[PDB]
Write a protein that binds this ligand. Sequence first.
Ligand SMILES: O=C(Nc1ccc2c(c1)CNC2)c1cc(Br)cc2ccccc12
Lengths: 39, 156
Amino acid sequence: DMYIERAGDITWEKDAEVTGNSPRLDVALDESGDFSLVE
Amino acid sequence: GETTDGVYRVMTRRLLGSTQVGVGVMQEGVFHTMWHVTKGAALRSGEGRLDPYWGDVKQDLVSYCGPWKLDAAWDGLSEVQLLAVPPGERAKNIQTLPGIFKTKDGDIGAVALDYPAGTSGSPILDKCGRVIGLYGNGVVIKNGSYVSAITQGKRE
Ligand SMILES: O=C(Nc1ccc2c(c1)CNC2)c1cc(Br)cc2ccccc12
């Protein structure tokens, strides 16, 4: 059996870690809810 | 049980030790998470019984104790934050600018951050704090890394 344990508050924190890129990717979604890379 | 509005971990004692299968969002008496995390199975909070209410495998979303409440939307231009709750580590707000997923049913936002599969169901936040979607379902890229869609449900 699964259970939940609180992990914190939902707040936008200023001066936080700004990392990560912004990629435009062509994808397709299937009946099983899975994304696929279409090229 | 504990229905205090906030971000929660989704744990299981079925495997060796306690294993974090995902993350969720408690907002307005409803616990919103990704479908592949629980698979529509009843959860437990302290002693309380959290029973499923709504779900969809294609959307990959599931809501407990009530209908989907989260209805914020990405503006397409602003930087967002991922309240990343990693298995075994403390929650962390990671600010980023999202890219794009180009589909046949329109375009959707995408966060390019590398995280383990146990972090699935973590909220993507805006500058106001509202939950604009869930991190956990996307695609594996040419570099091995993972790019996740900004998955948002539907309010009533
Ligand atoms: O397993 C993952 N995601 C997922 C799995 C099963 C299903 C779905 C999504 C939706 N339809 C069923 C995953 C999540 C994350 Br945050 C990082 C990953 C890194 C590498 C490989 C997979 C993942």
